[PDB]
Amino acid sequence: SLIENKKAKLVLIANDVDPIELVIFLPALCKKMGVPYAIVKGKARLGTLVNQKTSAVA
Amino acid sequence: GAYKYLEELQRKKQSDVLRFLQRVRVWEYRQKNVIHRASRPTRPDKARRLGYKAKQGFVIYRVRVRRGNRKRPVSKGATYGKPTNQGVNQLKYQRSLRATAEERVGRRAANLRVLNSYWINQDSTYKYFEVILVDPSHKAIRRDAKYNWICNPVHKHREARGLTATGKKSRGINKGHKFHNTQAGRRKTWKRQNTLSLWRYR
Amino acid sequence: VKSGIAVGLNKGKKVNQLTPAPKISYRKGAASQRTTFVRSIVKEVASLAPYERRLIELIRNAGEKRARKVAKKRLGTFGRAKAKVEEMNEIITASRRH
Amino acid sequence: PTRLTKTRKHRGHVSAGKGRVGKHRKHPGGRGMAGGLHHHRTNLDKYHPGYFGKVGMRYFHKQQAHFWKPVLNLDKLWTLVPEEKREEYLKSASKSAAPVIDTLAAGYGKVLGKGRIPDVPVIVKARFVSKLAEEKIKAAGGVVELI
Amino acid sequence: SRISRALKQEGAAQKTIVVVGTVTDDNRIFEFPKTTVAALRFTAGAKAKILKAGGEAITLD
Amino acid sequence: AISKNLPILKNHFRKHWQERVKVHFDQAGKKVSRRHARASKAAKIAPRPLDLLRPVVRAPTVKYNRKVRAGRGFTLAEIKAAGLTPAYARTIGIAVDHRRQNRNQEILDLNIQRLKEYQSKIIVFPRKGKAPEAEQTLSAAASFPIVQPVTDSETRAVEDNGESAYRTLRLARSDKRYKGIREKRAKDKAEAEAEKK
Incomplete structure (x- = not known):
């Protein structure tokens, strides 16, 4: 949604998501709404910065 | 909103990306058990529309069923009787494959209460169904009034009676002139x- | 309007007709910003279907009559083959043409 | 009453009034309309005719309401006018003050002209009319309003 | 109504119409004439419709 | 089987009917239990009536349109005009029926007045404390009956203007058949080809 409203300055996307479709679009989305994104390793790693187990996005 | 994408993605099913993710998954499940526990629902949207919630007591159980018709058992085709009912082969069990999946996991997971199910995949041999199940024993459910209803005793094996969604279709229960x-x-x-x-008085 | 008799085209009894406000449901066939936009994202993913690809390659060739006669088979009603073969034309002419 | 029935009266007599050659076996002519075209055709060619085959077109989902139109004869017509308020009208309406007969409300469709009304004018209100029914009302003095 | 016809016969407009049966009311007629009628039973329609005229509903005794 | 000039009875007892015979001996004793449960409502409910106030509605069809009748509930038009909410209408015992719509001003007035006479005749008990009861009238339909509307004129003017009802109905019928062919017969001859000319 934050991307849908152009409000995101930068998005990060875990490359490991089991329902791969959960994410697939985000690149196409961030492209369409002019957000710079970067598919980054570990849904694990995003978890640690945000205090969850996983995180999928950030 | 992530869901409306997934909602409207999944509908593109012969799509280059989905056909890949299909063929790859129909392997994962082919190699796993016939009724094995899905750690999380692989159509999280489809799930959560059908009353899945990501909270304790709710569960998802994948399950596989054989595609194709019912064979009338009868030794050797010896039906015995009016040639009308000599029909053994082209014969079609009236409960769906969806339901049979819900039913098979019901008896496996007797403590759970089926709530709904949804289609994942299929192939030659099998249809695959993700079955969402719920634990009326468990408290998170029993308290919170949104789910609490499912804990009542008149929802013990909703799948068997045909009180599931598939069940009610297969029972032929819509309103109208087309369903008298x-x-x-x-x-x-x-x-x-x-x-x-x-x-x-007569 | 009602002709004021039991038999006819307009038929029957005269009344003070108007009006029921259009119940919210009736609508539905407004596409609405969201659905279009999401659908427009999920048109750039993940390509056409293999009949839809068979369609626009068949539309570039002997491209109508034959297209609808195929899309009736690879869909259901002729009524939806109209919609799809019409839709294909718009996928042909928007992206590839112009 | 069992006392009164004839089987009491038969008691003693061997055959219960069914005869002795003919026995009273169970279903000696088949059942319930059988051999209609075979060994009962005799009875089905007297006493019934029309009883085989399918004359006429079909009507799928024939609702029995489009086929409502219950008739009202002009003889009867006046009965729909109230009982007390009749004495008065039938002896002098004299145009422009006629007792309106709503046949529809009284549960009739077509007004349909069998008998012969008086010369007193009526103003009928009805969903249909026979050509003649109107003719008989117009010539009496009243009119058919349609609805 | 029928009774009325049997009066409108020639030289019988003043005769006493003996019915042996019910006399039923008939609203198809209007101007039912002033007359005596013996019947077994009248209906409350037809007893009144006779008596309204000035007539006389009688019984067979 | 079969017999003398005797009509063709169609009777349906070739299945095992004598298993599924239901004889309402209850009837008379059921009534009791209904009367008794209607009363037990009335005590449980207490001041209110057993019935919610229901609206007037014209029955469907050709066969019944002439009749008026009690429908389900009141519409979010008829309530809003009578000056309350459906949410609240339910609290005061007016049957709201969302799914009915309102294409007749002469039915609405029938209802809107009916609601206005109801909201009048009832009193509401304050939620806070005191409840000054004035007995219970057991039914709304008792106090608010469905009296059929007025298309009435005893005596009335007569105007024989030579329309000929038969001729009118006959004509109206004609037109309804031949509109379809005649509107195609406009496209033929008088349009398209004459438009080309």
């Missing part, structure tokens, strides 16, 4: 209209 012969219930309306009703 079953509406309250097939064996009901019959047993209402195949009754002689006699008053005191």
Whole structure:
């Protein structure tokens, strides 16, 4: 949604998501709404910065 | 909103990306058990529309069923009787494959209460169904009034009676003119209209 | 409008007709910003279907009559083959043409 | 009453009034309309005719309401006018003050002209009319309003 | 109504119409004439419709 | 089987009917239990009536349109005009029926007045404390009956203007058949080809 409203300055996307479709679009989305994104390793790693187990996005 | 994408993605099913993710998954499940526990629902949207919630007591169980018709068992094709019912082969079990999946996991996971199910994949051999199940024993459910209903005793094996969604279709329970012969219930309306009703004064 | 008799085209009894406000449901066939936009994202993913690809390659060739006669088979009603073969034309002419 | 029935009166007599050659076996002519085209055709060619085959077109989902139109004869017509308020009208309406007969409300469709009304004018209100029914009302003095 | 016809016969407008049966009311006629009628039973329609005229509903005794 | 000039009875007892025979001996004793449960409502409910106030509605069809009748509930038009909410209408015992719509000003007035006479004749008990009861009238339909509307004129003017009802109905019928062919017969001859000319 934050991307849908152009409000995101930068998005990060875990490359490991089991329902791969959960994410697939985000690149196409961030492209369409002019957000710079970067598919980054570990849904694990995003978890640690945000205090969850996983995180999928950030 | 992530869901409306996934919602409207999944509908593109012969799509280059989905066909890949299909063929890859129909391997994962082919190699796993026939009724094995899905750690999380692989159509999280589809799930959560069908009353899945990501909270304790809710579960998802994948399950596999054989595609194709029912064979009338009868030794050797010896049906015995009016050639009408010599039919062994092209014969079609009236409960869906969806339901049979819900039912098979029901008896496996007796403590759980099926809530709904949804289609994942299929192939030659099998349809695959993600079945969402819920634990009326468990408290998170029993307290919170949104789910609490499912804990009542009149939802013990909703799948078996055909109180699941698939069940109610297969029972032929819509409103309207296209569904007279079953509406309250097939064996009901019959047993209402195949009754002689006699008053005191006739 | 009602002709004021039992038999006819307009038929029957005269009344003070108007009006029921259009119940919210009736609508539905407004596409609405969201659905279009999401669908427009999920048109750039993940390509056409293999009949839809068979369609626009068949539309570039002997491209109508034959297209609808195929899309009736690879869909259901002729009524939806109209919609799809019409839709294909718009996928042909928007992206590839112009 | 069992006393009064004839089977009491038969008691003693061997055959219960069914005869002795003919026995009273169970279903000696088949059942319930059988051999209609075979060994009952005799009875089905007297006493019934029309009883085989399918004359005429079908009507799928024939609702029995489009086929409503219950008739009202002009003889009867006046009965729809109230019982007390009749004495008065039938002896002098004299145009422009006629007792309106709503046949529809009284549960009739077509007004349909069998008998012969008086010369007193009526103003009928009805969903249909026979050509003649109107003719008989117009010539009496009243009119058919349609609805 | 029928009774009325049997009066409108020639030289019988003053005769006492003996019915042996019910006399039923008939609203198809209007101007039912002033007359005596013996019947077994009248209906409350037809007893009144006779008596309204000035007539006389009689019984067979 | 079969017999003398005797009509063709169609009877349906070839299945095992004598299993599924239901004889309402209850009837008379059921009534009791209904009367008794209607009363037990009335005590449980207490001041209110057993019935919610229901609206007037014209029955469907050709066969019944002439009749008026009690429908389900009141519409979010008829309530809003009578000056309350459906949410609240339910609290005061007016049957709201969302799914009915309102294409007749002469039915609405029938209802809107009916709601206005109801909201009048009832009193509402304050939620806070005191409840000054004035007995219970057991039914709304008792106090608010469905009296059929007025298309009435005893005596009335007569105007024989030579329309000929038969001729009118006959004509109206004609037109309804031949509109379809005649509107195609406009496209033929008088349009398209004459438009080309």
